[PDB]
Design a protein around this ligand. Structure first.
Ligand SMILES: [Zn+2]
Ligand SMILES: [Zn+2]
Ligand SMILES: [Zn+2]
Ligand SMILES: [Zn+2]
Lengths: 351, 634, 111
């Protein structure tokens, strides 16, 4: 009675430097009382969460937002590295209400040309939030399907608690013909995890492609406050940074330089990918009796592990999630939180 | 003996003893908390079975409250008859929820529940020839039938009838008790004496309505067309009485002002056979047939109205009858145009009878109408569940089982009357009003405190609010001059006491068809009996309103239904009552009964622009003194 | 079938619809060897057989009443049908008992 992936085929190329513009539906379909306020308002509530988390888990990526109203698609946020512009946009969109019907193809092409300026290293991907059962297409979608795949842009979409075969085909078509990207929801928490699994990069098996090196520099913080003066926005900045090359007083931003146009990053964003890059194997729950290890947690101090021949209480299980590489145990609360937040296996860290 | 003994089981068994009594140990493993000795059922958020529970408890018992965490319970011995109308597995209700109910169930309540549920339900009622017949659910029914004298006066000694059993069924016995026993035919006049003894002898019987036994072989064609209207709570509550396809004449306390006629024109035309529609009085019924039926399917030329003074199409109406209780069976049938109608009502089959707020009238006139006609079905669209024709033999069981009661939150919230709003505006009093409160000491000040112009000011916003919000306005004010003293103030084509119709017909063709006119009103003559028009905003003023049975009638009726969910409160209500007055008690007593039955009651004494609205005519307290020389004279 | 019965012994007949497998031996007056039906070995439902005797009105609804229209049954059917169009995905077919009956219901539903 366990719901776990048999193995995690992460080990190599994933989607790290990302250029995702998720597309929403703003139609009468999103207006209906499927979720407690409705689809859209709860979704807008739900959608807000991922934005910062996307920028949290993937600060090395850029993102804009497009919606679809009354049989027409409408971009609503610029592709940027700052959540706030995207964040503040949804607040109006929260106070805005979905209307009419969505135009899939309008979103198809508006986003398609939107991703044209994206560089090769920045990985192009799109995700869709759809509620209806039909589209509004000014032309041959399969042509656009052909156009997108010719652009080599894999895509995952998540419709509502239903299936669309072409959308099932589209996620298939976008993703090298591999259909694992039309997963749909059945519950709000089951919807919540969709956000939770979305922040992850996307390794399956990347074809041997041109791999590009990157050159940039770190920024240097400005100290004075009374000297308030800004260049990237022509403002007065009571504290900022300096480009490694153009050497411009720049406000706090891990984004690209505005003068010689180079990426400015200190350290934090880099190691975020690292634990993503090489994660650990799950701490294996050691057996109730075949383990016979120390009656305590390893990461934490959880002296209770079972119940010791207590009829079924001990025959239930043994909170003995043991990392295999370290051969050291961990309490489930510790072990799950470890794999949840910080891989950093102390048993493997200690050597 | 003839007093209403079996009707009032609801709300019983409310007691407990701390020091002496004991507690059901199951509370710890007890998701729910039902108290039989206390009469309530506290199924809070811990009680998750409110879906089935509300389905079962609503039928079995009464809802004490509607808390967000969980509603409340009322000991519904009448709900025992209501649960008797359900008939599901009895143990599951006591047992399946009993696990949730941590404390044990009430034993005396259980003994009462045994008496209430099936105890008063097995006397005798045989079925004869596609109708009720001379038999019994129990042999005592036959033995009492063997002793039947008043019942025996009008029965066919044949076990049943084909044409008589179709017609005589000595009247419609299609509401007879437990069948599957040998019967004897029932004649074609007078089951009144059959049910006369049952009032005094108390035959406690399990009944039903054999709906298809209302064959009514001659089908007097009706217009089953979508000209008439319907909203979803009907096709639930109607479906409650419709049953599974085969429409059963059931008992439905239907407020006139809930799509009442909408129920009928669906139902009646559904029978597509000879129907009788019936309202109070020849003058009163006239308004009733008028203002809904022609946008609806009905045309006046066929729904004939008699008085014995209005010689109309009796024995010749190609259409059905809309009738007047006054005309039908009363001493003042002092001529013959009404007389031959019954002769025709005996002469012609009748598959449907419509009853409207007959709680106004004693059954003396009413049971007179039912003593010869020999119909097939009836329908009492009741106004108040406590009435003067609901004796031990209730009208709740002559048409059919219970199917509709005071639960609009489950029913009316289907978009039919969704987002039901009740508000009690407490207008602060002024010196002159209170000096009037100081002045006299009688119920004539009912005229001298209804006169509040700030109440008009608050209502004037509601006018302008629903001038713009697109909500339908109803103002309940039986006044005449003060209405005109405010009809001049408010400024729309005015409906007044003793209005000639066509202007109101223009005013209501400015209500169903036009929008430049944005207000209407009700007096003591329109009500009654006008078919209450579209409603998204109600204003009510009178609160003494003899009787409370009329008030419990007045509650759901003055606020009509609305196929609406767009408005945040698809039926606004406003009880404009000047605070610190006599009717404050009455309006608050109304306010409790506003919140007693589930109507979403509230209070807004801080109106949205109470004074900001224009035409503040007579606003100044000296102005409130200037004209006060008039109202005191009332 | 008798000459084709006569000409050969090895003959194979199959169907996913044939029920019961005994009328046809009665009908075509022949003896088979194995009269057996196979069941779908599915660990999942994959199809919901639904008998709508009662509509939203809970009316026993039928096509045997007439070859004509009665909105009590028909408009109930029309109201019943439309809710599927919203929820169902691409792919939904109806099967009338008769083409003339098919057209009969079409025009008024169009109306
Ligand atoms: Zn700046
Ligand atoms: Zn620079
Ligand atoms: Zn631990
Ligand atoms: Zn480890």
């Amino acid at each position: 009675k366990k719901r776990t992936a048999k193995k995690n085929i992460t080990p190599y190329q994933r989607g790290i430097i990302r250029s995702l513009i998720l597309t929403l539906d703003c139609s009468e379909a999103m207006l209906e009382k499927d979720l407690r306020p409705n689809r859209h308002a709860m979704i807008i509530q739900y959608a807000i969460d991922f934005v910062h988390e996307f920028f949290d888990q993937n600060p090395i990526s850029q993102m804009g937002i497009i919606i679809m109203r009354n049989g027409l698609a409408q971009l609503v946020s610029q592709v940027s590295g700052n959540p706030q512009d995207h964040i503040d946009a949804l607040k109006s969109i929260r106070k805005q209400e979905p209307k009419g019907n969505p135009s899939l193809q309008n979103a198809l092409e508006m986003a398609r040309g939107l991703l044209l300026p994206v560089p090769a290293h920045c990985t192009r991907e799109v995700l869709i939030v759809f509620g209806s059962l039909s589209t509004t297409d000014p032309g041959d979608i399969h042509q656009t399907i052909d156009s997108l795949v010719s652009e080599k842009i894999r895509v995952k979409v998540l419709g509502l608690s239903a299936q669309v075969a072409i959308c099932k085909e589209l996620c298939k078509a976008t993703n090298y013909g591999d259909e694992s990207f039309y997963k749909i929801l059945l519950d709000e928490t089951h919807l919540k995890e969709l956000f939770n699994e979305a922040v992850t990069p996307l390794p399956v098996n990347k074809i041997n492609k041109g791999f590009t090196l990157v050159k940039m520099g770190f920024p240097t913080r400005i100290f004075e406050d009374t000297p308030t003066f800004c260049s990237c926005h022509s403002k007065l900045v009571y504290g900022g940074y300096f480009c490694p090359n153009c050497h411009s007083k720049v406000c706090s931003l891990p984004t690209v330089c505005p003068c010689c146009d180079l990426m400015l990053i200190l350290s934090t964003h880099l190691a975020r990918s690292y634990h993503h890059l090489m994660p650990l194997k799950t701490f294996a729950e050691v057996p109730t009796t075949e383990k016979f290890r120390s009656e305590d947690c390893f990461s934490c101090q959880s002296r209770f592990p079972x119940x010791x021949x207590x009829x079924x209480x001990x025959x239930x299980x043994x909170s003995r999630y043991r990392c295999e590489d370290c051969k050291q145990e961990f309490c489930v609360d510790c072990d799950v939180f470890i794999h949840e937040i910080l891989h950093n296996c102390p048993g493997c860290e200690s050597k | 003996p003839a007093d209403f003994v079996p009707d009032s089981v609801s709300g019983m068994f409310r007691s407990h003893d701390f020091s002496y009594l004991r507690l059901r140990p199951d509370h710890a493993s007890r998701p729910l908390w039902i108290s039989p000795s206390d009469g309530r059922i506290i199924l809070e958020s811990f009680s998750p079975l409110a879906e089935q529970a509300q389905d079962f408890l609503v039928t079995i018992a009464e809802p004490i409250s509607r808390p967000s965490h969980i509603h409340e319970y009322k000991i519904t011995a009448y709900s025992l008859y209501a649960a008797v109308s359900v008939g599901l597995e009895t143990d599951d209700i006591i047992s399946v929820l009993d696990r949730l109910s941590k404390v044990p169930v009430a034993e005396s309540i259980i003994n009462f529940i045994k008496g209430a549920t099936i105890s008063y339900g097995k006397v005798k009622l045989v079925i004869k020839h596609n109708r009720y017949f001379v038999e019994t659910t129990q042999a005592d029914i036959l033995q009492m039938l063997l002793n039947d004298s008043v019942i025996g006066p009008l029965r066919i000694d044949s076990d049943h009838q084909v044409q008589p059993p179709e017609d005589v069924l000595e009247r419609e016995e299609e509401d007879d008790d437990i069948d599957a026993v040998h019967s004897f035919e029932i004649a074609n006049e007078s089951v009144e004496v059959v049910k006369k003894r049952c009032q005094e002898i108390d035959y406690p019987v399990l009944e039903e309505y054999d709906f298809r036994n209302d064959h009514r072989n001659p089908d007097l064609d009706i217009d089953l067309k979508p000209s008439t209207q319907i909203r979803p709570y009907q096709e639930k509550s109607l479906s409650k009485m419709f049953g599974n396809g085969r429409a059963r004449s059931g008992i439905i306390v239907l407020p006139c002002g809930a799509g009442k006629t909408l129920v009928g024109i669906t139902a009646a035309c559904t029978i597509k056979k000879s129907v009788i529609v019936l309202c109070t009085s020849s003058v009163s019924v006239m308004q009733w047939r008028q203002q809904f039926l022609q946008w609806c399917t009905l045309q006046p030329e066929n729904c004939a109205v008699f008085t014995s003074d209005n010689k109309e199409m009796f024995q010749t109406e190609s259409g059905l009858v809309v009738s007047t209780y006054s005309m039908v069976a009363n001493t003042r049938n002092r001529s013959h145009d009404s007389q031959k109608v019954m002769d025709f009502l005996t002469g012609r089959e009748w598959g449907f009878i419509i009853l409207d707020e007959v709680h106004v009238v004693p059954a003396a006139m009413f049971r007179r109408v039912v003593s010869t006609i020999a119909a097939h079905a009836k329908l009492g669209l009741t106004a108040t569940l406590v009435r003067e024709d609901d004796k031990i033999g209730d009208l709740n069981f002559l048409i059919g089982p219970k199917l509709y009661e005071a639960n609009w939150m489950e029913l009316s919230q289907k978009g039919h009357i969704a987002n039901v709003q009740c508000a009690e505006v407490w207008c602060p009093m002024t010196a002159e009003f209170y000096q009037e409160y100081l002045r006299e000491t009688a119920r004539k000040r009912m005229l001298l405190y209804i006169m509040n112009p700030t109440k008009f000011q608050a209502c004037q916003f509601l006018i302008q609010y629903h001038e713009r919000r697109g909500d339908k306005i109803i103002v309940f004010s039986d006044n005449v001059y003060a209405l005109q003293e405010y009809a001049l103030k408010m400024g729309k084509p005015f409906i007044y006491g003793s209005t000639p119709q066509q202007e109101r017909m223009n005013i209501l063709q400015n209500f169903q068809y036009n929008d430049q006119i944005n207000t209407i009103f009700l007096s003591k003559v329109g009500d009654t009996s006008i078919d209450l028009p579209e409603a998204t905003c109600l204003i009510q003023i009178s609160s003494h309103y003899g009787s409370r049975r009329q008030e419990a009638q007045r509650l759901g009726r003055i606020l009509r239904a609305k196929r609406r969910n767009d408005e945040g409160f698809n039926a606004f209500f406003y009880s404009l009552v000047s605070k610190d007055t006599q009717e404050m008690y009455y309006s608050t007593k109304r306010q409790a009964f506003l919140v007693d039955q589930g109507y979403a009651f509230k209070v807004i004494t801080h109106l949205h622009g109470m004074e900001n609205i224009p035409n503040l005519a007579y606003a100044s307290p000296r102005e409130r003194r200037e004209l006060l020389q008039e109202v005191l004279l009332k | 079938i008798k000459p084709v019965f006569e000409r050969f012994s090895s003959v194979i007949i199959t169907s996913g619809t044939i029920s019961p497998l005994d009328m046809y031996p009665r009908m075509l007056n022949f003896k088979t060897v194995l009269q057996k039906s196979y069941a779908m070995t599915l660990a999942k439902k994959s199809f919901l057989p639904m008998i709508i005797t009662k509509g939203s009105d809970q009316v026993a609804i039928s096509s045997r009443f007439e070859i004509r229209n009665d909105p009590s049954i028909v408009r109930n059917y029309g109201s019943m049908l439309v809710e599927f169009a919203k929820i169902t995905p691409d792919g939904m077919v109806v099967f009338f008992p008769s083409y003339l009956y098919m057209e009969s219901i079409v025009s008024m539903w169009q109306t």
